[PDB]
Structure 1
Amino acid sequence: GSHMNPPPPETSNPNKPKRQTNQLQYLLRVVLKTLWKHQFAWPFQQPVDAVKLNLPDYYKIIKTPMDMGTIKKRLENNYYWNAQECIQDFNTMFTNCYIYNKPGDDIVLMAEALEKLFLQKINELPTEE
C-alpha cells in the first residue's frame, strides 16, 4: 500500500525456530476464534491505515504496531515458539489502542470489551503439555 504506512509486522521467517504447542493451538482455536468473530473485532482485524484514516501522527506515536490480522496469520503460519509471544502480541495491540486514543472513545470501549474476553480466555489457558 502507501509508502506512508510502515511495512506490516513479520509473519514468516524460515530462520526463526517454531513450534506448535497445545497452548498455541488453544490460542488459535479458542482465543483468536472467539475474539475474531466478536461484534467489536473489526477495528482490530487489520493494520491501521493511517493514510486512509487521515491520522498522519499514528506511526509517530505507535512504534510497536500489532493487529489481530497479523496475530491470526502468525498463528496460521505457526510463527511462534511459545504462547507468551502470542499473548504479548495481543497485549501490544490493546496497549497501542489505549495509548493512541482517549478513555471512553468508541475504539477504547471496544478494545476494553475484547480485552476482558481475552483475559477470561487466558485465565483458562491450559498447562503446556
Structure 2
Amino acid sequence: MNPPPPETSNPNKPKRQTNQLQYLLRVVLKTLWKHQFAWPFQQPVDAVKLNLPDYYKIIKTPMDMGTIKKRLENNYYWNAQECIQDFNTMFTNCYIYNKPGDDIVLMAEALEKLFLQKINELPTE
C-alpha cells in the first residue's frame, strides 16, 4: 500500500536558484532520464501496482527522479548539495531494498556512475 509521494513544494522552506541547480536540471537529470536504465527511477515506486507490499516497510525515505525533477522545476532546493543528496538517497534505497547482483541493482549501479561523472565538475557561481 502507498504512502503519499515526497513533497515537491513547501511554502515554509526557502527557495533558491543557483547556476549549479540549473545545471542539475538541464544537464544531469535530463541526461540521466534518457538512459536505457532510467525507467525504474522516473517516478515514485508504486508498491500496489508492483506487488511490493514490503517496499515502504523497508524504505523510509523514498526518492525518485520524477520527484527530483519537480523539485528542481519548483526551485524547491536551497543548493545543489541538497539535490545531490536526493539522488544519493534514491540510489541507496535501491541497494537497501534489493541485493547485489539483482537486475535493478545493476541498473542503479550504472546510473550512479553516470551521475557521478556528471557532477564531478559543476559550474561556478
- TM class by shorter-chain length? over 0.9
TM-aligned CA deviation for residue 125 of structure 1: 1.4
The TM-score, its normalising length taken from structure 1, stands at 0.94
How far does residue 124 in structure 1 lie from its aligned partner after superposition? 1.3
Q: CA RMSD in A?
A: 0.7
Which residues of structure 2 form unaligned runs of 5+? none
* 1:83-123 deviation per Cα after TM superposition (whole angstroms, max 9, x unaligned): 11100000000000000011111111110110000001110
**TM-score (ref. length: structure 2):** 0.97
| Alpha-carbon separation, structure 1, partners of 2:62 and 2:80 | 19
1:48-69 per-residue CA deviation (whole Å, 9 max, x = no partner) reads 1111111111101000000000
1:30 corresponds to which of 11, 27, 31: 27
- Pairwise mapping of residues 86-101 of structure 1 onto structure 2 (< 5 A)? 86-101=83-98
Distance (Å, rounded) in 1 between the aligned partners of 2:13 and 2:61: 19
3-state SS in 2 of match to 1:52: helix
Compute the displacement of 1:126 (Å): 2.2
Identify unmatched segments of 5+ residues in structure 1: none
Asked if 1:76 is matched to 2:60, the reply is no
Look up the SS of the partner of 1:51 in the other structure: helix
Partner Cα separation in structure 2 for residue 64 and residue 14 of structure 1: 21
Residues 3-42 of structure 1: per-residue CA shift (max 9 Å, x gap): x200000101121101110000110011001111111100
CA–CA separation in structure 2 for the residues paired with 1:114 and 1:83 = 18
User: Matches of residues 96-115 of structure 1 in structure 2 within 5 Å?
Assistant: 96-115=93-112
Partner SS state of residue 11, structure 1:
coil
Distance in structure 1 (CA, Å) of the matches to 2:34 and 2:14: 30
Once residues 48 and 94 of structure 2 are traced to their aligned partners in structure 1, the CA distance between those partners, rounded to angstroms, is 17
Alpha-carbon distance in structure 1 between the residues aligned to 2:43 and 2:105? 16
**Aligned-pair distance for 1:70?**
0.2
Question: Percent identity between the aligned chains?
Answer: 100
CA apart distance, 1:43: 0.3
